[PDB]
Design a binder for this molecule. Structure first.
Ligand SMILES: CC(=O)N[C@H]1[C@H](O[C@@H]2[C@@H](OC[C@H]3O[C@@H](O[C@H]4[C@H](O)[C@H]5[NH+]=C(C)O[C@H]5O[C@@H]4CO)[C@@H](O)[C@@H](O[C@H]4O[C@H](CO)[C@@H](O)[C@H](O)[C@@H]4O[C@@H]4O[C@H](CO)[C@@H](O[C@@H]5O[C@H](CO[C@]6(C(=O)O)C[C@H](O)[C@@H](NC(C)=O)[C@H]([C@H](O)[C@H](O)CO)O6)[C@H](O)[C@H](O)[C@H]5O)[C@H](O)[C@H]4NC(C)=O)[C@@H]3O)O[C@H](CO)[C@@H](O)[C@@H]2O)O[C@H](CO)[C@@H](O[C@@H]2O[C@H](CO[C@]3(C(=O)O)C[C@H](O)[C@@H](NC(C)=O)[C@H]([C@H](O)[C@H](O)CO)O3)[C@H](O)[C@H](O)[C@H]2O)[C@@H]1O
Ligand SMILES: [Ca+2]
Length: 876
């Protein structure tokens, strides 16, 4: 075969139309199938990308010679690129993986994967001198080994994809060949987009059918999911909008359910041409659809373009087997869809009517895009730093700009709303979607707010008038006032500026005031900044983090003492209405700036649905604002916004009386050793959730858990909870807590049979009916514990235990420090073992360890030193 060499082609410019041509429907595929009558060479010039979608066509078929020698030159001559489509798994190996099936020639190694990528491009692109490669990423094409999805092949395919992108596409050695990805997945479910996106020219999304258009439906929340907008936004993270193309499907002959998309017109007996009409079809909606932000899309594509013109069979209606007949297409749908996009307002070119100043016009086209549709949508930064710009006329056409930077524009004299973006002030989105929505959603959300453009002004040395009045600007940041040396008239009134003393805003205003006054002729019309309504925000930090209070019979409001206040975005704190009026009466050059109608409750934030969490030193937890001080206790207090209930906005330590150390739950995350309780729910006893009704029931009616403290310490308290308010009179009514006495029976390899067989010590026997029980404990230092609970119900009582807490202080080998001390008075209440005056030099050291251990401020290093030096006085 002699393959002709590449034909000069005019560059691709959107809007683009693409088509997947099924090879088995080309005349030359199987000469025996006389019904196969179409030809890929017959595709019209309106088709920019003809995709070779291969199946059923034999390796030896004369189609491949026809493609390379006739079709490609014919299509290239008219500007149509011919793209080879291959499935995802061709990049992975394993089942049905094309070239990659030869795992010995192309091993899964760094050099083997480099070789596979070169082989893939040589075989599927260069062999017939095609114009690019399209990798199809869907479940249909996922890497598989023995009919099983292969995570290993998926990982390999990521590597091979990058290697291909170094050969072709925008980052490749041969930039004259397109590297294209199509996918059914949302971007977060596309395993290859994050690494593959820099290497591709175009991204195609298959969104066939009403569910591609509207998204799926969330049955519970009754909302659309994976909408066209949400799909684009997921990929906007990775590609530009002009790289984005969306796909519909023609009606494939003899299609099953699950392959019926209704993307083109349903047949009608009384109009045999209705399949070639496009108005109102999903296909035309896709042609007209545009993202709401970012920019205009790259175009659209069709699957099965050889079926162009065939009407779709009716959903509910008697069969029409005539639609399954194979007829030669005239590609009328494809021609009309291309013309719909080419004639759309969105793809109108930005010209002199929009920006008369060519220097400005060239800056917008370079940065925003050449199409008028981008003015409506562009979402990033427009930097204007060419000093040749003599006019900003046309900037009002930018509707969604995130940042406008005006730098060094010497010859601009005035700035107001006529030469500024339309979103300098609050605006709502005005673009209307052309897509059908869910009838079962009633979705007409009113016109999302457009975030306002951030404005930077630096070096406009000829700027004489700066009018930003009535735009609800949040700050003046970005205004390099010292550089605006020709200002004569400034209006910043009717915004949201905190212009208080010490703010950054005030300094920019004061710098401009100096400039304007030095010019002279200052009147009441010349420098106006009043009617400000600055937004009141929640303070980031609060002033009170520690409070020592005396023991007294009184209740305090913790929220009133610790959490209040409102700040502006410049840091001006207001406590109360009294403080606010002082702020409201501030003056700049003898003139108040805060709007007089903007009262305190309009400005102040509220702490209505803020929650409080108060934990004492024994880890008892309440959510009460009011705290008694009659009892001597040390508390941790945390406040939670309703917006985040896991994560406090403010924390404070309140000491009542002498300070006590905050204890810890040493049984938190304890490992289950033994007992008869259900192992899954037994673990949930120590996870940390006091309302852990993930079914915390341990057995039928009487349960036991043997557990090991993950890192033992000094135990002084314990607590357990019955199912919080979910049940009553099913409560645990009897409980016994036991500690193991450091006597592992010479079988440390087993440690379960040993504990279920030794003699323990009972640290507490609970009998009662409280929802929650807590109790002090006598400095136990055991690593191994057993809890036994009983709700006194029938043998099918299904006793439950949401949490158990073993509470104390972290101190490794606390077992030793109580073994030694226990013997310290098994030796000092009996005289004359070593007894001399040494006995009272013992007793001063035993009285100092019981004092060190039983101290409210637990200091581990103090006890060690007291423990270590009592240890020294035994051998002597
Ligand atoms: C390429 C590849 O890979 N392939 C693969 C595949 O894949 C797949 C595919 O797909 C396709 C499809 O598609 C669809 O669509 C869709 C798409 O997909 C997507 N995409 C896009 C963008 O969008 C989306 O969606 C869409 C829609 O949905 C569709 O289109 C379809 O179509 C169909 O359907 C429709 C409706 O619906 C219609 O309309 C159409 O038309 C169609 O239909 C069809 O048609 C056809 C035509 O005709 C038919 O056919 C059949 O055929 C047969 C044949 O046969 C024979 C033989 O074979 O032998 C012949 C002879 O002649 C005879 N003889 C005498 C007569 O004497 C014989 C007989 O039978 C005797 O008797 C014996 O007994 O035979 C027959 O004829 C029958 O009958 C017929 O029927 C059919 O049927 C129809 N169907 C219906 C249902 O209707 C389409 O289809 O593709 C893609 C891309 O590419 C992918 O992704 C997917 O996934 O898959 C499969 C499964 O698995 C496979 O298969 C297999 O294969 C094997 C072989 O292979 C291989 C290995 O070896 O592995 C592969 C690799 O790669 C390669 N390479 C390398 C390694 O390198 C290889 C080579 O070639 C060498 O050889 C080796 O070395 O290969 C085996 O065969 C087995 O068996 C199987 O299973 C495949 O592969
Ligand atoms: Ca729990």
């Amino acid at each position: 075969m002699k393959v002709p060499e590449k034909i000069p082609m005019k560059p691709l410019k959107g809007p683009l139309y693409g088509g997947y041509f099924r090879t088995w429907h080309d005349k030359t595929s199987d000469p025996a199938e006389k019904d196969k009558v179409n030809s890929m060479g017959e595709l019209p010039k309106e088709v920019d990308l003809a995709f070779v979608f291969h199946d059923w066509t034999k390796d030896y078929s004369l189609f491949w010679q026809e493609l390379a020698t006739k079709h490609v030159p014919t299509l290239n001559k008219q500007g149509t690129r011919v793209i080879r489509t291959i499935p995802w798994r061709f990049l992975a190996g394993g089942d049905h993986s094309g070239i990659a099936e030869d795992a010995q020639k192309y091993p899964n190694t760094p050099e083997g994967n480099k070789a596979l990528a070169k082989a893939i491009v040589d075989e599927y692109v260069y062999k017939y001198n095609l114009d690019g490669l399209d990798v199809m990423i869907e479940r249909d094409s996922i890497p598989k080994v023995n009919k099983e999805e292969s995570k290993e092949g998926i990982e390999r395919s990521i590597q091979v994809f990058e290697e291909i992108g170094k050969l072709i596409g925008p980052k490749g050695a041969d930039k004259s060949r397109l590297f294209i990805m199509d996918s059914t997945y949302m971007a977060d479910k596309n395993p290859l987009i994050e690494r593959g996106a820099p290497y591709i020219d175009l991204l195609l999304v298959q969104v066939y059918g009403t569910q591609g258009e509207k998204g799926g439906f969330d049955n519970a929340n009754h909302k659309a999911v994976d909408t066209m907008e949400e799909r684009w936004e997921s990929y906007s993270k990775y590609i530009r909008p002009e790289q984005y193309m969306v796909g519909f499907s023609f009606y494939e002959e003899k299609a099953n359910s699950g392959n019926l998309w209704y993307d083109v017109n349903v047949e009608d007996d009384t109009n045999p041409n209705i399949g070639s009409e496009i108005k109102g079809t999903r296909a035309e909606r896709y042609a007209k659809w545009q993202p709401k932000t970012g920019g205009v899309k790259g175009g659209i594509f069709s699957y099965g373009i050889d079926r162009d013109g065939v009407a779709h069979p009716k959903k509910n209606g008697p069969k029409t087997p005539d639609l399954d007949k194979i007829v030669k297409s005239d590609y009328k749908v494809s021609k009309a869809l291309k013309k719909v996009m080419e004639n759309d307002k969105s793809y109108e070119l930005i010209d002199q009517k929009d920006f008369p100043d060519k220097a400005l016009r060239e800056a917008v086209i370079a940065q925003v895009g050449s199409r008028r549709g981008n003015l409506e949508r562009f979402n990033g930064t427009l930097r204007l730093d060419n000093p040749d710009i003599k006019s900003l006329e046309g900037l009002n056409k930018l509707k969604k700009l995130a940042k406008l930077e005006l730098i060094g524009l010497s010859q601009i004299t005035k700035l107001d709303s006529s030469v500024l973006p339309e979103n300098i002030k609050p605006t709502k989105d005005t673009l209307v979607s052309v897509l059908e929505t869910y009838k079962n959603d009633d979705r007409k959300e009113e016109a999302k707010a457009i975030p306002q453009v951030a404005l930077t002004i630096s070096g406009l040395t000829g700027l004489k008038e700066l009018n930003l009045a009535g735009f609800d600007r949040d700050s003046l940041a970005g205004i390099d006032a010292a550089s605006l040396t020709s200002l004569e008239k400034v209006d910043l009134s009717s915004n949201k500026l905190d212009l208080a003393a010490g703010t950054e805003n005030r300094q920019i205003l004061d710098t401009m005031l100096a400039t304007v006054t030095k010019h002279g002729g200052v009147s009441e019309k010349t420098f106006v900044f009043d009617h400000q309504k600055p937004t009141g925000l929640y303070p980031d930090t609060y002033g009170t983090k520690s409070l020592q209070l005396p023991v007294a019979n009184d209740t305090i409001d913790l929220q009133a003492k610790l959490l209040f206040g409102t700040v502006t975005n410049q840091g001006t704190l207001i406590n109360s209405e009294a403080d606010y009026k002082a702020y409201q009466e501030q003056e700049i050059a003898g003139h108040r700036f805060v709007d007089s109608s903007y009262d305190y409750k309009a400005f102040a934030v509220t702490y209505k649905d803020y929650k409080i969490k108060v934990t004492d030193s024994t880890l008892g937890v309440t959510d009460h604002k009011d705290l008694s001080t009659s009892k001597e206790e040390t508390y941790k207090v945390e406040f939670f916004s309703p917006i985040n209930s896991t994560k406090p906005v403010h924390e404070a330590k309140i000491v009542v009386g002498e300070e006590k150390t905050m204890m810890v739950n040493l049984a938190e995350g304890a490992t289950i050793i033994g007992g008869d309780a259900d192992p899954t729910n037994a673990k949930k006893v120590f996870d940390g959730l006091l309302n852990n009704d993930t079914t915390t029931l341990s057995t039928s009616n009487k349960a036991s858990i043997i557990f090991e403290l993950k890192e033992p310490g000094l135990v002084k308290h314990w607590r357990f909870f019955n199912d919080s308010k979910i049940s009553k009179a099913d409560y645990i009514k009897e409980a016994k807590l036991e500690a193991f006495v450091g006597h592992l029976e010479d079988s440390s390899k087993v440690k379960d049979s040993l504990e279920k067989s030794t003699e323990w010590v009972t640290v507490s026997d609970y009998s009662g009916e409280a929802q929650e029980f807590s109790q002090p404990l006598n400095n136990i230092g055991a690593k191994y514990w057993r809890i036994t609970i009983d709700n006194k119900k029938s043998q099918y009582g299904y006793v439950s235990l949401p949490e158990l807490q073993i509470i104390g202080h972290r101190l490794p080998e606390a077992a030793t420090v109580m073994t030694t001390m226990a013997a310290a008075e098994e030796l000092s209440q009996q005289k004359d073992k070593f007894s001399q005056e040494q006995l009272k030099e013992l007793e001063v050291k035993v009285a100092a360890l019981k004092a060190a251990l039983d101290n409210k401020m637990f200091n581990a290093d103090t006890i060690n030193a007291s423990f270590a030096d009592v240890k020294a006085y035994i051998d002597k």
